[PDB]
Design a protein around this ligand. Sequence first.
Ligand SMILES: O=C1C[C@@H]2OCC=C3CN4CC[C@]56c7ccccc7N1[C@H]5[C@H]2[C@H]3C[C@H]46
Ligand SMILES: O=C1C[C@@H]2OCC=C3CN4CC[C@]56c7ccccc7N1[C@H]5[C@H]2[C@H]3C[C@H]46
Ligand SMILES: O=C1C[C@@H]2OCC=C3CN4CC[C@]56c7ccccc7N1[C@H]5[C@H]2[C@H]3C[C@H]46
Ligand SMILES: O=C1C[C@@H]2OCC=C3CN4CC[C@]56c7ccccc7N1[C@H]5[C@H]2[C@H]3C[C@H]46
Ligand SMILES: O=C1C[C@@H]2OCC=C3CN4CC[C@]56c7ccccc7N1[C@H]5[C@H]2[C@H]3C[C@H]46
Ligand SMILES: *[C@@H]1O[C@H](CO)[C@@H](O)[C@H](O)[C@H]1NC(C)=O
Ligand SMILES: *[C@@H]1O[C@H](CO)[C@@H](O)[C@H](O)[C@H]1NC(C)=O
Ligand SMILES: *[C@@H]1O[C@H](CO)[C@@H](O)[C@H](O)[C@H]1NC(C)=O
Ligand SMILES: *[C@@H]1O[C@H](CO)[C@@H](O)[C@H](O)[C@H]1NC(C)=O
Ligand SMILES: *[C@@H]1O[C@H](CO)[C@@H](O)[C@H](O)[C@H]1NC(C)=O
Ligand SMILES: *[C@@H]1O[C@H](CO)[C@@H](O)[C@H](O)[C@H]1NC(C)=O
Ligand SMILES: *[C@@H]1O[C@H](CO)[C@@H](O)[C@H](O)[C@H]1NC(C)=O
Ligand SMILES: *[C@@H]1O[C@H](CO)[C@@H](O)[C@H](O)[C@H]1NC(C)=O
Ligand SMILES: *[C@@H]1O[C@H](CO)[C@@H](O)[C@H](O)[C@H]1NC(C)=O
Lengths: 339, 339, 339, 339, 330
Amino acid sequence: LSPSDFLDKLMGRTSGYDARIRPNFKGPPVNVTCNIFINSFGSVTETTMDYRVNIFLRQQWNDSRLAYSEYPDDSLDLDPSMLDSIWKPDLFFANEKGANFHDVTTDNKLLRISKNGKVLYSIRLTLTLSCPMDLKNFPMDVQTCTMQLESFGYTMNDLIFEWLSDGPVQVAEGLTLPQFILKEEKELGYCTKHYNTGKFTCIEVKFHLERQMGYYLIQMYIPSLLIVILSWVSFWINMDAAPARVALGITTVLTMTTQSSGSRASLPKVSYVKAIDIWMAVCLLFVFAALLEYAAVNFVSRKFVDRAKRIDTISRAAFPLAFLIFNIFYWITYKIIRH
Amino acid sequence: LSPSDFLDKLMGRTSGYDARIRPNFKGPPVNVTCNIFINSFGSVTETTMDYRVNIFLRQQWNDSRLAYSEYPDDSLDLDPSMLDSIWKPDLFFANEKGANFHDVTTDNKLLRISKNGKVLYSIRLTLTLSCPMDLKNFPMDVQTCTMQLESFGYTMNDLIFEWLSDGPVQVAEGLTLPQFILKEEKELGYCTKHYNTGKFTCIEVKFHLERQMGYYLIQMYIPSLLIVILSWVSFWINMDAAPARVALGITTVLTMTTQSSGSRASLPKVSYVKAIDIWMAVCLLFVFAALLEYAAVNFVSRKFVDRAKRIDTISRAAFPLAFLIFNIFYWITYKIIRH
Amino acid sequence: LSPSDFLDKLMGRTSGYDARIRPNFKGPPVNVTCNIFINSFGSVTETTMDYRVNIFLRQQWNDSRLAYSEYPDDSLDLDPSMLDSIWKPDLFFANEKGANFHDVTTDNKLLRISKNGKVLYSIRLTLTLSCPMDLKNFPMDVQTCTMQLESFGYTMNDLIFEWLSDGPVQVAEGLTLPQFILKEEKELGYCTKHYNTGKFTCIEVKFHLERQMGYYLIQMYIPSLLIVILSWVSFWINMDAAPARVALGITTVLTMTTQSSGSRASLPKVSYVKAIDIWMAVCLLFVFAALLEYAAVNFVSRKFVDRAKRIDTISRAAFPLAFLIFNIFYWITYKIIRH
Amino acid sequence: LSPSDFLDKLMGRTSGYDARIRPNFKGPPVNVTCNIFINSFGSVTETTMDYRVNIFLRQQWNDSRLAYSEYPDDSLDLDPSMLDSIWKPDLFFANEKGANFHDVTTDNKLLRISKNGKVLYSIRLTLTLSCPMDLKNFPMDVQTCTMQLESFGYTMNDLIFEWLSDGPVQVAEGLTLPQFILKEEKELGYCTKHYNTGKFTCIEVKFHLERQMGYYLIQMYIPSLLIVILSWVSFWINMDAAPARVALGITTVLTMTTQSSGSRASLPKVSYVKAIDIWMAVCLLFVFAALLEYAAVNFVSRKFVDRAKRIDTISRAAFPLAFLIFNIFYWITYKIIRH
Amino acid sequence: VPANSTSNILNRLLVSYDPRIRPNFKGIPVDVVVNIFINSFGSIQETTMDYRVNIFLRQKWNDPRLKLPSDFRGSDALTVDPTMYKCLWKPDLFFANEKSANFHDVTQENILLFIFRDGDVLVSMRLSITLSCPLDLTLFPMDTQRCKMQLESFGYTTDDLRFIWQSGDPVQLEKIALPQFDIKKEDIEYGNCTKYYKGTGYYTCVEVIFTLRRQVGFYMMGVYAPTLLIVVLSWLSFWINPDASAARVPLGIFSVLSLASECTTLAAELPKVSYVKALDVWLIACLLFGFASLVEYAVVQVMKRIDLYARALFPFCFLFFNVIYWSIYL
Ligand SMILES: O=C1C[C@@H]2OCC=C3CN4CC[C@]56c7ccccc7N1[C@H]5[C@H]2[C@H]3C[C@H]46
Ligand SMILES: O=C1C[C@@H]2OCC=C3CN4CC[C@]56c7ccccc7N1[C@H]5[C@H]2[C@H]3C[C@H]46
Ligand SMILES: O=C1C[C@@H]2OCC=C3CN4CC[C@]56c7ccccc7N1[C@H]5[C@H]2[C@H]3C[C@H]46
Ligand SMILES: O=C1C[C@@H]2OCC=C3CN4CC[C@]56c7ccccc7N1[C@H]5[C@H]2[C@H]3C[C@H]46
Ligand SMILES: O=C1C[C@@H]2OCC=C3CN4CC[C@]56c7ccccc7N1[C@H]5[C@H]2[C@H]3C[C@H]46
Ligand SMILES: *[C@@H]1O[C@H](CO)[C@@H](O)[C@H](O)[C@H]1NC(C)=O
Ligand SMILES: *[C@@H]1O[C@H](CO)[C@@H](O)[C@H](O)[C@H]1NC(C)=O
Ligand SMILES: *[C@@H]1O[C@H](CO)[C@@H](O)[C@H](O)[C@H]1NC(C)=O
Ligand SMILES: *[C@@H]1O[C@H](CO)[C@@H](O)[C@H](O)[C@H]1NC(C)=O
Ligand SMILES: *[C@@H]1O[C@H](CO)[C@@H](O)[C@H](O)[C@H]1NC(C)=O
Ligand SMILES: *[C@@H]1O[C@H](CO)[C@@H](O)[C@H](O)[C@H]1NC(C)=O
Ligand SMILES: *[C@@H]1O[C@H](CO)[C@@H](O)[C@H](O)[C@H]1NC(C)=O
Ligand SMILES: *[C@@H]1O[C@H](CO)[C@@H](O)[C@H](O)[C@H]1NC(C)=O
Ligand SMILES: *[C@@H]1O[C@H](CO)[C@@H](O)[C@H](O)[C@H]1NC(C)=O
């Protein structure tokens, strides 16, 4: 007979099958094993704390009601129109903000019945999941971006999720991200939500997005460091040439202020203090300290010329030690201690 | 027998259940015990006057026409497809701008009919609520984002909303707003709209958003104060090299106004005086006044030099006290009083 | 009789036809031939790695059950609302981010059945595909942005896609992207994915998008080269004479720095080093080197002027050569070896 | 009696009216007299090359299969509920990028049948029509953003679109754009598609969007021109020292570079050369030429000073003349020649 | 006897009720009485000319085919579900200056219809419309925006349908806060503007005209008082001794460079509109006065006693420019 007519004989008006009840009703919880397949991973933005994915979701389970042993073909199937007429596990993503199917040229959902009752359900979803990013150390941060699947109305004694054996999460081959890069060390696990009614099952996968810092190290760190070195050599050599000293120092602090100011439209606009803001503030403070020590020299000037040269050599010996201990205490903090 | 046939026997085109009339009709009002549980809290802007929340909403009530004892099932589940055959309160949010459910895998609604007529209804909404926020004191502001649930058709003679006993508003453990802090004192209370046609039930919860002053205080306030210190140490030095002193001095004014011009396009785009624009106006006023008093000293020098020395000393002794009195009358005004 | 009632007997209920059994069931596969007419193109975004394209997708095949002999005209078409009565090839795009049909005046779909069974199916889609853009050499690069059709649930022994023989993909005439220019030589081949279930058919197009360089040449390269020439002018004039050389040096510093600051809000925000970033950092470094090797001359000046003349002449004969070797390296690295 | 009964008598299941068969079948083609009425016109963006229009769309044809002489209502206002029972021409806009209907308080359609079958159909659409914008000459240009209504699946032997004679495309009064001004000459025209299947009718209209350049003439032209005049005032003096020369060269180069930076921030993000970048690069080159004239002065200054004064007089004669030659060539090229 | 039994014996199963035949057919025109109730009013974009607004648009008319009989006396207002909301007639209004309207569908449909005992019918619905009012900002930092919202019938001439306002507070709004503008509920003056179309009919319309007024305080402590300070500093540039001017050159050129930087930087926060605004006139007149101070110093240098005329003539023109400017733009 026809495959559609045989499927109507299997789970239609006859045989007494109600698709509003779970398999193994009043018994053990079902064994729903699901894996994903991520194609896109885009728009990890720090202004709304989300990131968009475009996944395949394949979940298999068992039901003793849809066991057929008459048709020759072992892998039955049904079109995505009549998916109401079969019990599906009601999952939802526990931290998503917007989720939509795809229905281009056909609905992008595929259901398959095997001979043993191993039902396979493949959806193509587009998700906007929420990740709580913090940028307390901005150009060297790592992010743990979560994705949590969780049951909706079925407790632990009725439905249980678990990932597959080999390759439960896998990503498309040649994808890339603008800012971050997606490390291939994804931590899978269970974070079972515990409410007042039951312990609703929930599985999760945590990605480690690592930010690369080539553009920041080229255009914000090294030019500021070189401006500080220029303000160093402004006073390391010159002794009493004030028109070759004070305009140089003031245009240097102007250049440092403009460099620190024009790079606020190139950062995620947050309020808590970041690493790049600490670097900009300390560099501005050091160029200000160079101007202030020149002004102290000019104040003590107008003998005490040996004392003035002592101030000059003391500053020329203290600025290397101070800037180097700041440099060490900055990179060791934001590169080793916050690993 | 199945619970679906039992529910069709209890309510539908066989029994006498009507889906349009409230329970215990022509009597006391029904009290709908409502609580929420937010998941995300982001996209709080200042150019649209809105924020976006992503809640679970659970509301319980009493439906006396659902009492049953001829079935051992304590809590009859009900599918969200045939959900429009049972009474549900016409709740709606009195300040939203856009609201939608989710259908991630199945419908994201749940209905549970208890044995004693208790009905529990749990949906999952995404809302774009509105909140009128003022920015009179911008980097030290507090906001009260309100959420107002209320009925639509029934007055307070038919429907009454009431919060849960314990934890009426719970927050997902681990949120992080981009430029804010969500406090843990959510003042929940009554709304009770008094319209012309009666009084409609209305409950509300007010959050608390305290913007933390890290990035503004380390990127704008301290550089502007640093340029003010450069303005003072400009005319602190001796007045022999008048072109060099006026050069540094003017350049300092240029640095301050370039700092303010760059700091313009990072702030929110409102059209009234924020507490950071008062600062960027007064510091520019002080650097300009320092330049103008130095130029008045050079206009005097044309009481030959003792008047010039006395003017320079009086200015260098009067500007610190004036700026620190302004600093007190600014910080104690904005930080402490309008907390 | 009529073209809307003849199909009720050709494919309707009183005939042998089911809309989800494929043609030639349990036998040879069907050869769906696809072609594409692109109307619009653009929105190539480097922050979400997508591009929107508005196509006419026409797929044609031929079965045997849609054949007739008693009817007058050659090819009759049917209602785009009755598009669920025919087996259509379950197609989907392998890397879309969301696509939709069009519904202006009438659903922009069409299916036309010939007498010999040659079914044509022409739809109009509005896809937003994703192509990974690697901005490693930003102002001079090519992007191979692709488009991959794929079957969904029918392996390569049931459904086989193959491109049209004469002009498979053809873009509209007056196409103008904002940044890129779409090259008229469009590559096309077969993706032919291999999953754990079987071979799935897959055919792909690759558009080579070449970025235009006129804006970056006129506005970002030529002025910075001019600033480098002004840096050389800052020490080619008579040495150690007066405060007229450190002024030009630090002004070349400040203009090069505001150029390198303002040239980071008009570029794509990616966090790896690009070509123009390297070329701006090296120019800022050469300006800093010119000012540092003038500060060296000003230090060693205080027969001490003969050594200053020697190092000034050596620098004036070395720095143009040092810029020319870097210029040759940069241009032959980003224009010849990497195409 | 009632129109809801008479229309069912006229086109219902009783009367013979095949809804998906064109009028005058196997005969002459139906003449669809089409006109639009644009309400809004805005969001003409240069980043996706599309404008958004909001039109009324009236199309009125004739068919003898709806002629009636029963009762004297000479206009059967058919409701848009049973709109799928009348043949309507499958029109679609051949360059849209997404377009929708309006369904506020009632569906915004209308289908009025006259006495002789002169059926009229008025819809209200919101479209985002693509338009290839040419920005080769940015602030002084015209756009030919067009709009094409063409048939889907119907050749010209079946359906002929033609415009209304008495001023078809009308514009709502007081319709201003933020950038352009819509000219009052909207040129109609007969497009026609010549495919390999047939000739598809295509009526079209071409607007004219002349950009107004008051803002660019006030801000992007006159300040930079005054900067070039200031750089001429620099070398118009006979000072063979440079306490004003290096100062004015510094100032003019700095202002030209920061004005070019702000222009980069304000102009549209188009990666080919425009008629504003040419002008800014030429003005920066002229300031560079003036500073190199100063460099020649200071270098050749030690007969010597006589030849220096002679080349200064030559440059003071040349630079206004070369500027006037460039000004005439540029403005005649970009205001009268290409206009 | 339940609440839907009277509806089912009142229309569509009882004696004929055609839901597309208007009340008083072949008679007097229907008088629909509307009154909106604004919730939120935001996103007044100067680059798309829209503004989103949420309204509780309610409309109340007369339907003599729906007179409630004496079957029950306790219910004066017999309700009806939004399921059969398509089952009885309703006036077909539409906003003639909208872009994309949509209803709200949170926890229920947000439409509510009442049928009264004396034949009256009331409809409330929660709309979130995005209208289109043209913003002609030619006086940008001190401008007003008188822009409006108009409801019109669709397919019904004025002898068939007619909208009138409630005439006692027919448009209300909450205590709201725009980012830039300041919505004036003082001037909320509404009115009729019927649309006589070209030959084809005479269609009704009503409208409310809001009078938005932008507040100027940010621009005054923004690019007005700093720019005026820079110009007064350029005036004070002359007060240094003109003999061997080592300070007049910087005191001119850095003020001019600062003003040029202020202009080319705060061209960003302004709305990108390519016609000449007021703020650009002010900034360019101030930049031209800085350049005029440079020119006057230059003709002092190349040729003195001209500064004694400059200090009393050029601020005497700055005050004239200021009074004519802030008299035409206020
Ligand atoms: O009683 C509740 C309230 C609570 O709401 C927060 C959201 C939750 C999500 N899932 C879906 C519905 C819920 C649930 C299932 C079965 C009975 C009661 C019940 N709920 C919500 C609950 C949690 C847990 C669970
Ligand atoms: O009579 C009215 C007018 C008034 O309109 C402002 C909006 C309001 C919101 N809810 C929804 C509709 C309304 C209402 C319910 C039942 C009868 C009349 C009625 N209304 C509106 C009313 C308020 C209160 C209530
Ligand atoms: O069992 C699976 C999971 C797997 O998911 C990665 C994506 C794939 C894309 N196509 C679409 C659905 C899929 C498929 C077809 C038929 C049976 C099972 C099945 N899938 C996915 C699969 C691959 C291959 C194939
Ligand atoms: O054979 C074709 C291919 C071609 O595809 C580009 C798009 C076009 C748009 N309309 C809609 C479908 C089409 C058409 C109608 C009837 C038979 C064949 C057929 N097409 C497409 C065609 C053009 C013209 C026409
Ligand atoms: O035939 C038309 C076309 C014309 O389109 C411009 C817009 C108009 C707006 N209102 C709403 C629809 C319309 C109308 C009503 C009844 C019959 C025909 C008809 N229209 C449009 C018309 C005008 C006038 C009127
Ligand atoms: C699925 O997992 C549960 C977990 O306890 C187990 O008890 C059960 O036997 C498994 N297999 C099924 C339901 O086939
Ligand atoms: C389903 O049942 C079959 C039959 O033994 C078994 O092999 C398979 O592992 C089961 N699947 C799950 C997920 O329990
Ligand atoms: C509901 O609230 C009312 C308040 O008027 C109270 O009298 C009543 O006892 C409450 N409970 C029920 C079941 O009505
Ligand atoms: C509902 O009914 C139960 C039992 O009849 C009662 O205890 C309770 O107070 C009622 N009200 C609510 C709000 O639960
Ligand atoms: C499809 O192509 C294959 C080529 O191997 C052929 O064997 C088969 O008959 C074709 N099927 C149809 C329906 O044309
Ligand atoms: C139609 O089938 C025949 C089989 O020989 C062949 O021309 C081809 O496979 C089909 N034509 C198409 C797909 O255009
Ligand atoms: C339609 O228009 C064409 C050309 O304008 C004309 O020849 C023809 O007579 C018209 N009528 C019909 C019914 O084709
Ligand atoms: C439609 O046909 C009628 C027949 O009398 C004619 O009067 C009318 O002008 C035609 N309309 C058009 C647009 O051709
Ligand atoms: C507005 O003008 C129309 C024109 O006839 C009139 O009928 C109506 O009463 C007027 N007043 C309103 C709508 O308040």
